[PDB]
C-alpha cells in the first residue's frame, strides 16, 4: 500500500510534468491558442482538444511561468521527468516481485534492531 | 511631497505594466529568445537588448504567467494601464497648478471640521 501510494504521487507529478513537457514540445501552438483565447476555460478546453491534455495538464500549462520557457529550464524538467519515471519503474519492480518486498521488510527490521535491541534481562535456566 | 510619492508609485507600476505591454506586443520574439536562452540573465539581457527594456521590465516579462497571455488578460492590462496613466496625468495636473493644491487642503480641512469641530466653551464678553 505504501509503494502504491508513492507510485500514485510520483505518477501524478509525472503526469503534470508530462503535460508541461508537451507544452515545451509545441510552445508556439499553445501561445497561438492563448492569444486566440478569450477565457481561461476556453484556453484549457482548446489545449485539451488540440494536444489531448488533461484538466491538470492544462491548468499547469496555463499557470506555467514564462521564465521556465528556456533550455536552461527544459533541461531540469526533462532530467527530473526521467528521474521520476525511473522511480515509477523502481516502484513497479517493487510491486511486481515479492522478493524485494521481503527485502524492504528485512532492511527496516534490521534498522529497528540496530536502533533498539537490548538482550535478555531474564535468564533461561533449566 | 505626497503627490510626488504617489506619482512615483503609480509611475513605477505603469513602467512595469508598460514592459509587460511591450511583451504583449511581440510575444513571439520574446518566446523565441527564451527558447534560445540558456540562463535567466542571458534572457533578460537579450530582451533588454532587443526591445530596449529595463531590469524591472525584463524580470516582469520572465516572471509573467502564461495564463496572462490571452486577450481576456490583455484587455485588463491595457485598461488598467490607461487608468494608471490617467492617474499620472491627474497627479501631474495637481503638481502643475497650485490652485488644486489649495483645493485639496480646503477639502481635507473641511473633512476634519465635519469630524470634530465643537464650539466655544468660553464666551467672549466685553
Amino acid at each position: 500500500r505504501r509503494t502504491r501510494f508513492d507510485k500514485e504521487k510520483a505518477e501524478a507529478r509525472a503526469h503534470i510534468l508530462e503535460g508541461l513537457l508537451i507544452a515545451l514540445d509545441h510552445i508556439d501552438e499553445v501561445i497561438r491558442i492563448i492569444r486566440a483565447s478569450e477565457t481561461d476555460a476556453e484556453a484549457q478546453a482548446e489545449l485539451m482538444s488540440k494536444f489531448k491534455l488533461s484538466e491538470r495538464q492544462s491548468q499547469a500549462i496555463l499557470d506555467m511561468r514564462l521564465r521556465r520557457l528556456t533550455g536552461l529550464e527544459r533541461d531540469k524538467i526533462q532530467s527530473e521527468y526521467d528521474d521520476l519515471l525511473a522511480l515509477i519503474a523502481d516502484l513497479a519492480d517493487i510491486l511486481a516481485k515479492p522478493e524485494r518486498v521481503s527485502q524492504i521488510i528485512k532492511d527496516e527490521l534490521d534498522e529497528v534492531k540496530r536502533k533498539f535491541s537490548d538482550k535478555r534481562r531474564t535468564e533461561l535456566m533449566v | 511631497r505626497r503627490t510626488r510619492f504617489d506619482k512615483e508609485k503609480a509611475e513605477a507600476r505603469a513602467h512595469i505594466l508598460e514592459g509587460l505591454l511591450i511583451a504583449l506586443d511581440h510575444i513571439d520574439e520574446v518566446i523565441r529568445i527564451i527558447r534560445a536562452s540558456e540562463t535567466d540573465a542571458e534572457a533578460q539581457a537579450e530582451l533588454m537588448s532587443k526591445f530596449k527594456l529595463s531590469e524591472r521590465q525584463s524580470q516582469a516579462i520572465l516572471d509573467m504567467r502564461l495564463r496572462r497571455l490571452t486577450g481576456l488578460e490583455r484587455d485588463k492590462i491595457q485598461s488598467e494601464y490607461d487608468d494608471l496613466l490617467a492617474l499620472i496625468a491627474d497627479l501631474a495636473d495637481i503638481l502643475a497648478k497650485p490652485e488644486r493644491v489649495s483645493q485639496i487642503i480646503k477639502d481635507e480641512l473641511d473633512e476634519v471640521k465635519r469630524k470634530f469641530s465643537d464650539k466655544r466653551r468660553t464666551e467672549l464678553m466685553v
Partner: protein, 229 residues
C-alpha cells in the same frame, strides 16, 4: 576645584550653544509646523509604530514608554509619562490626542501613580496627525541608536499650535497658549489661503480667540487685537 582645564574659548561657546539648543528643543518650546514638542512627537510616532489605534483596545502605557526609551527618547520615564498624562486629559489639553484608560487626574489637581497602572491609545485626532506619514511626506532622521528612524516634524493636517498652544520654559524666552476653536480656525486658514492680504481685524471677525478646554469669560478685545497683531 578639581578640573583645571583652561583653554576653552570656542569649546565653551560650542558646548554652551549645544546645551542651550538642547534645552530649547527637547525640554522647551515646540515647533511651528506641527505645534508638538519633541517628547510629544516621539510619543505619537512610537504609538504609531506600535499601531495602538482605536481599532484595538487600550494598551499599557509602560510598554509604550519603554519602547520610547528603547527607540527614540532616552530621558526621564516619569517625564515622558507626564507628557502622556497631560496630553490625555480633557481639561489639561483641548483636543485629547491620546485617549487614556484609567485614573489620570482631576481639575482639583491630581496625578496618576505611574506608567504601569493605567492604559492609553491614540484618539481619533492622532490618526489625523499620522495619516499619510509613510509616503515620503516628511524626511526621517537617524536617532541616537542609529537603527531607528524618527520624523523631523509630524505631517499635520490641522494647525495644532492654535488648537493646543505652547507652554514655555524661559531660559530667557517663554511662550504661551492661545487656544482656538477648530472650525473657526479652519475657516481662517481658508480665508488666508484665498486672499493673501486679509487684515487681522477681518480675521478677528473669523477668530474669536481663546477656546478654553473648560470654558471661561474673556475680557478685553484690545489685548486680543494686540496679540494677533
Amino acid at each position: 576645584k578639581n578640573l583645571v582645564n583652561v583653554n576653552l574659548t570656542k569649546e565653551m561657546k560650542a558646548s554652551f550653544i549645544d546645551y542651550a539648543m538642547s534645552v530649547i528643543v527637547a525640554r522647551a518650546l515646540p515647533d511651528v509646523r506641527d505645534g508638538l514638542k519633541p517628547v510629544h512627537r516621539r510619543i505619537l510616532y512610537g504609538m504609531n509604530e506600535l499601531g495602538v489605534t482605536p481599532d484595538k483596545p487600550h494598551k499599557k502605557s509602560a510598554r509604550i514608554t519603554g519602547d520610547v526609551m528603547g527607540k527614540y527618547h532616552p530621558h526621564g520615564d516619569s517625564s515622558i509619562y507626564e507628557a502622556m498624562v497631560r496630553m490625555a486629559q480633557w481639561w489639561s489639553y483641548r483636543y485629547m490626542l491620546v485617549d487614556g484608560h484609567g485614573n489620570f487626574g482631576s481639575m482639583d489637581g491630581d496625578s496618576a501613580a505611574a506608567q504601569r497602572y493605567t492604559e492609553a491609545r491614540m484618539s481619533k485626532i492622532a490618526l489625523e496627525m499620522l495619516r499619510d506619514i509613510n509616503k515620503n511626506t516628511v524626511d526621517f532622521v537617524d536617532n541616537y541608536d542609529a537603527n531607528e528612524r524618527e520624523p523631523l516634524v509630524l505631517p499635520a493636517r490641522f494647525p495644532n499650535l492654535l488648537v493646543n498652544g505652547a507652554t514655555g520654559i524661559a531660559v530667557g524666552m517663554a511662550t504661551n497658549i492661545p487656544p482656538h476653536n477648530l472650525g473657526e480656525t479652519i475657516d481662517a486658514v481658508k480665508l488666508v489661503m484665498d486672499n493673501p492680504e486679509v487684515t487681522t481685524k477681518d480675521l478677528m471677525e473669523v477668530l474669536p480667540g481663546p477656546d478654553f478646554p473648560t470654558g471661561a469669560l474673556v475680557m478685553g478685545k484690545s489685548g486680543i487685537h494686540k496679540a494677533y497683531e
